Each structure stands twice: as C-alpha cells, then as structure tokens.
Write a protein that binds this ligand. Sequence first.
Ligand SMILES: c1cnc2c(c1)ccc1cccnc12
Length: 160
Amino acid sequence: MGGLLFSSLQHCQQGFVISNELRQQQSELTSTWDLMLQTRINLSRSAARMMMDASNQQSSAKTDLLQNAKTTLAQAAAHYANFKNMTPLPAMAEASANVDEKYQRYQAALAELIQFLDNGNMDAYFAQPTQGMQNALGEALGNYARVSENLYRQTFDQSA
Ligand SMILES: c1cnc2c(c1)ccc1cccnc12
C-alpha cells in the first residue's frame, strides 16, 4: 500500500513478526496441497494406464508412475511436518486444528490408493471416496487462508 502505513517502528516491526510467521506457515500448507494434488494426478494417470489393458511389460504394481506418487506424497507430509512444527498463533488455532483433521484423512486416503494400485486392484481404487476427502481438505485450507488474510490485514493501517 503506500503513504501513511505504520504509527512507528514498534508498530511496523510488530506487523512484520506476525506476517513473517504467517508467510512461513502458509508456504508449508501451500506446498503440502500442491504435492497432494500431484499425487492424485499421478495415481489417476497410473490407473488410466492400468485400464487400457493389454498393457506393455510392467505397469501396475511396479514401474514408475506409482513411484512418482509415492515421492510427491512423501514430500507433502514433510512440508506438513514443518507446518506442524511451527508455533500455532492464537488467531489461527481453530483453522489450524480443522486443517490437521482433514489433512490426516486425505494423506491416509492417498497412501491407500497407492497400495490398491500397487496390488492391481482397480475396484478398490474406485470404491474409495477420494474426492469427498480431497474437497474437505480444500475447504479447510481455504478456511485457513481467509483467517490468515484477516490477521494479515490488521497489521497495517486500515485506511488503504
Ligand atoms: C518485510 C516483510 N514484511 C513486512 C515488513 C518487512 C515490515 C512490516 C510488515 C508489516 C506487515 C506485514 N509485513 C511486513
């Protein structure tokens, strides 16, 4: 914004300390959603290959699309672990708990789907209610985003 933003160095610096945590927290969450979606996509392209069958050598249990799924899923929980390590801010603590809930469920879901397809079991792949659990975490993360956005807005002058 521009002009008259902060009452003093104490007020500017206070707003920096909150915004710099917020930022780091949000970086971790953003990278965790992003690698869970790449994992879902990489399960999808595996399964579609599976379903074209006749196939070509090894495709299902082993070979490398599923290995890719295993890698991006194992990078998303690492970012979540960095998130979980961080100081819960008072203003963010409900949002953050609601996030862990749906995160836990969508991680587990994703991990399971990897084992279904590694077992070649396409009916279980499709039987799992994956999208409801993906969306729930989407809504929890958009709920965190909003609450971070309000906390962030209170750090500088309310008048533009
Ligand atoms: C570098 C990065 N962000 C900031 C500052 C400096 C200083 C103040 C501040 C206040 C609110 C939010 N972010 C910042």
